[PDB]
Paper text:
Nylon hydrolase ([name]) is one of the three enzymes responsible for the endo-type degradation of the by-products of nylon-6 manufacture (cyclic and linear oligomers of 6-aminohexanoate (Ahx) with a degree of polymerization greater than three) and various aliphatic nylons (e.g., nylon-6 and nylon-66). However, the post-translational autocleavage of the nascent polypeptide between Asn266 and Thr267 generates an active enzyme with an α subunit (27 kDa) and a β subunit (9 kDa). Based on the X-ray-crystallographic structure of NylCA, we reported that four αβ heterodimers (molecules A-D) form a doughnut-shaped quaternary structure. In addition, we proposed that the nucleophilic N-terminal residue Thr267 in the β subunit functions as a catalytic residue for either autocleavage (from precursor to active enzyme) or substrate hydrolysis.
Numbering used by the authors:
A (entry chain A), B (entry chain A): 15 to 28, 31 to 259, 267 to 355
C (entry chain B), D (entry chain B): 19 to 260, 267 to 355
The structure:
Amino acid sequence: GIAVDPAPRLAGPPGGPGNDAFDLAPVRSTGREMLRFDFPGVSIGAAHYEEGPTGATVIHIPAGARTAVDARGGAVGLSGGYDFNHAICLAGGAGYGLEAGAGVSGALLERLEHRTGFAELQLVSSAVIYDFSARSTAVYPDKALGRAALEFAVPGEFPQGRAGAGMSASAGKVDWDRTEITGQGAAFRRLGDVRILAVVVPNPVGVIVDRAGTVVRGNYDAQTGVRRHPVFDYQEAFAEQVPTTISAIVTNVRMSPVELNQFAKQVHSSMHRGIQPFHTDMDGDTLFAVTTDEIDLPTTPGSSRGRLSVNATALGAIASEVMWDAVLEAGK
Amino acid sequence: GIAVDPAPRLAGPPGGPGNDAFDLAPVRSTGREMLRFDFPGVSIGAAHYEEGPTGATVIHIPAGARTAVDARGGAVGLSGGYDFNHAICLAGGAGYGLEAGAGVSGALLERLEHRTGFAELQLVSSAVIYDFSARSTAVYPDKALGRAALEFAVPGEFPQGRAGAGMSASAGKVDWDRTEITGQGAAFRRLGDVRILAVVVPNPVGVIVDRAGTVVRGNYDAQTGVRRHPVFDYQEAFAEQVPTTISAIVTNVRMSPVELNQFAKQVHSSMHRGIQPFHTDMDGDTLFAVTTDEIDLPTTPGSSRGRLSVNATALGAIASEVMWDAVLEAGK
Amino acid sequence: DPAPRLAGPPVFGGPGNDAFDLAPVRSTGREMLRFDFPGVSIGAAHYEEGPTGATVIHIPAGARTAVDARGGAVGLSGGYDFNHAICLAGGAGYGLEAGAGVSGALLERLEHRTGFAELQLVSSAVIYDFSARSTAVYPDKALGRAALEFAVPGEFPQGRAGAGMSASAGKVDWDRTEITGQGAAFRRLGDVRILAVVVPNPVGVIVDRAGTVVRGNYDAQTGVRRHPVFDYQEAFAEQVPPTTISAIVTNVRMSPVELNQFAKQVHSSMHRGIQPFHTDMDGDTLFAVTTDEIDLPTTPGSSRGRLSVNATALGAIASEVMWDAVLEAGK
Amino acid sequence: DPAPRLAGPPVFGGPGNDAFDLAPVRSTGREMLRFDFPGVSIGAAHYEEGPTGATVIHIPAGARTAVDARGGAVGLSGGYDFNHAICLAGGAGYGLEAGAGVSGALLERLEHRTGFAELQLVSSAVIYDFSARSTAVYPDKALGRAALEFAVPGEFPQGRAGAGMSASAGKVDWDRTEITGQGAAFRRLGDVRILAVVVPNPVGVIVDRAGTVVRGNYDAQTGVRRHPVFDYQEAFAEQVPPTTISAIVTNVRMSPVELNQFAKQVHSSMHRGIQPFHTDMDGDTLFAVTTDEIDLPTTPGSSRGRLSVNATALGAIASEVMWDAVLEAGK
Ligand SMILES: [Cl-]
Ligand SMILES: [Cl-]
Ligand SMILES: [Cl-]
Ligand SMILES: [Cl-]
């Protein structure tokens, strides 16, 4: 059970200098703690500019992996969106921060010795959060930051908390006076040979909610010292006036394109448990579902626990709980 | 707080005669209780065949209303899917049960005196659940049943429980030995002049879960007398072997097509709180978001409860809680 | 240029299904196309009282399907990724009932078995053909049942037959709209089979490969058909300021991604023979169906070129089979 | 038939961006199109070292946009429903970097303000143009910045210019692929303005309105271009068994649903001038952009017909402006 910290992390009231105002040196992000996991073939790197503060987080899978993209929000900021990726790049800096993905792409082209055959094309999908209201600069994750995240990527490690894309992520935006800093978060599970890793950068309009139904991050009211569910503010506002989260889930279980896409949708929708409201017009919510195609499900779905108990739906259910864990690490 | 009944309603272990084996007479469904609400312009009718047992539930809005359709599942059964509807028809009988919608359509053409100008076209969207494993007949909602639901429709009333499309709906299908009968369910809220009505026929692969996180319908294990979360069965199955919900939300608040579509997605995803897992490959999950375009939101979204507190996202949040209530009435 | 078939002014006011004792007629159209495609049957039925009809493609074994619903006024039921039949019909929204007739009849043939892997799946799409006649009659359950019962292997009745009974083209102004028809074409290449079925009811006109307008937007004042774009641009100079439903069925194995992209390609290709097309006023809908009997080779090469045997290539061949079908429809 | 411009065999092995001191060149192409469209600017820049380039449409006030991404190999960034610029580029995936250069330069012009309603939005799409040259050079940040800086109102450099520097057509076999170009066209009708920009790098060929293949799939053995479908069907007889990126910019107000359906229509219409099109091998992507300055009348009638002034009608006019653009590209 994740020990979330009850103390407030109000982001504060929302120009400022841009990138070239500074001599920007990428910092390898360590965050508050390192998650360690065992998943050969998948590396994660995180880098930030302290001058933002803002960052990027890169998932490198050099073999390339089949990918489904679930771009559910109404304000999505997305590059590539490919159904096969060598890397995924998550970044702050809103639409400007997609540039970090170009830094990754360029650097992978260089590792391939600038080979450009169709089958050699290095494919990176990027998505962004708007993290500018959480700080007083206009610094964004650029080319050099994306390359540095890629260079910093190591297998079996993830920096929890204020790190990479999560450096100035924040939640709960009915009013900015009640918005709190979140983080990024990851969690991982091995069942048999099955491996599931979840990565998340929740910058939601809504709030982070734990399995008991407590609001644990975002919409902190300084006048009461309490975090209410946004619906309460929304209903009072209506009674008076009338009259983004970016994520990845990576598994080693083979799924067809159709399965993987429905998997993506299932795990994504499940995140409305831990973030509320979710998939709003104001959110750019995007989830990447990625399989390394290492392990087959059985032909038939049966087990002592039910006829319909082993299949891609079952794995979605299990992966959804890994994701919830990741959202809670980010809000911790 | 909805007093769900803890007693089990196991559906039982899953041919049988079809429609014409019987002299099928539509029954006006009354269910276990009538919800009463005030929403001029929207009528609901429910009819069933006792011989199924199976039913249909029809939302008649004779003025016609702008509609967004969120067909999220992997096994959707849908007819029309129109962005403007005179009626919505929900039915059992799987794909065969879309015929009820044709019964509605034909009967509306007759009220219009068979006028067929472009602007006079009567538009009905239909969606279905597969409810055949809950009974031992092959009877399905037909033309005559849809017409009878339409004829039975009255304003300001909804039959809760085993009624209309919810007559043989059931939940929790990791194994059919643990599947329970659900129902249909509705709930309604008036804030100021704003009216929100929710209607739901949850026939999920997953289970119905209340606001405290208790599983309250589906995946009842007769050997333990308890309902576990499906994830527990799924994880045990994996450790061992390796190595549909149809709904409507109707409001009187004007929304543009773009808003209404994102509204649909938001409220739909929120239902993964009350049904888990949701939006799976095995589900045909479909939500209809409908506005009668009677009341404007304010131009600006501000209030004493926050700068971003009155808008279509806020209304999604409020409508999501009306929907949860409706899912709980269905599982009650 | 062919003789005109102007629809004439729409005479709304007329009797609907309940006013008649409606008798299904097996459509024979103007001529029969004969082809060899084992496991595919086609049945066509109409009511003279409309006149209006439905055309059903029956594939008993069931076949994977991709759906490209492109217009802004689509009228579609099911849209399944696996189908035992496809139902095309007039009657606008109301003709979606014909498909329920097919679904019901198939269930009876399956002796009312209902296990999740035995459900009989029918996708249906419709055209609005009310303006081309003076009744409110639409293809109902019984007419869908009749078309399935009338289905035989390797025949297709061309012209005013089934769903093509009252299809029409060229709707810049109703005074220049012409009756079309339904149309089919078939090509076999080694073991590769491609059947194209089409029911054009376009806002636009049918155009042949020389760029001639061959059906729709015929001006009785001048004796000549015009491309709609000439009417449109003149309309704009003056005032500012002052559906097609189709199936492509083949026996080549394609993955769901491949078949989907193939459906999109062939569908777009039809803007060569119908113009304009995929408009907000159309409900254009194409079903791509494969019986999954023949493999494409593992690599795409041949004496005709390195990227010459693949799904895009089939796309291109099928696009011509489809253009032939549209032209039969308009003939 | 025009003289051939065969690309020649792809000579992979060559130097990339880091091997050069890359100097942006303002593209002038083969000739300048001049037009009058207040509030729209176009800038084009290339590196000779590729050769490869980027073309940027700048709309300072920002404009509503619909995106139709149709191919099975799309390479797209942003895809926003509101844009201050559109960036088209070679370099395949890698050329999406040019758009980040534009985004960065716009931010500087906005003095680094970052409120949610002042974000500078750039959508970018790319073609793979590596096979048409012998280097790995791609349009980078600086090249995107250069094209935005080079932007002026009412000019468009036709031909090998900007993103069209190494665009090519006709990819049944690389030995028959021909260099294309980029192309634009402009039509004004009363106050109604329509600009069409296109960068065809199709697997298919460019075809004119008479149905002639005018660029791509040229056989040096015979001196003649072929429609790909002839190669494909012969390939199949033998062996079984044995991208275009574009913008349509107008000043007419359309609702988001209207503009979207309009984008889809115009995009499909391009299967008349490029064949095949919307294939799984293409990343075909079209941006429909409106400056929202002129209203369509409330009802659609005119002396040219009852349904003659509306968004479908604009669709049809814009489809011809676009075909002119493709032909300029291939010229
Ligand atoms: Cl576990
Ligand atoms: Cl309330
Ligand atoms: Cl049969
Ligand atoms: Cl500017």
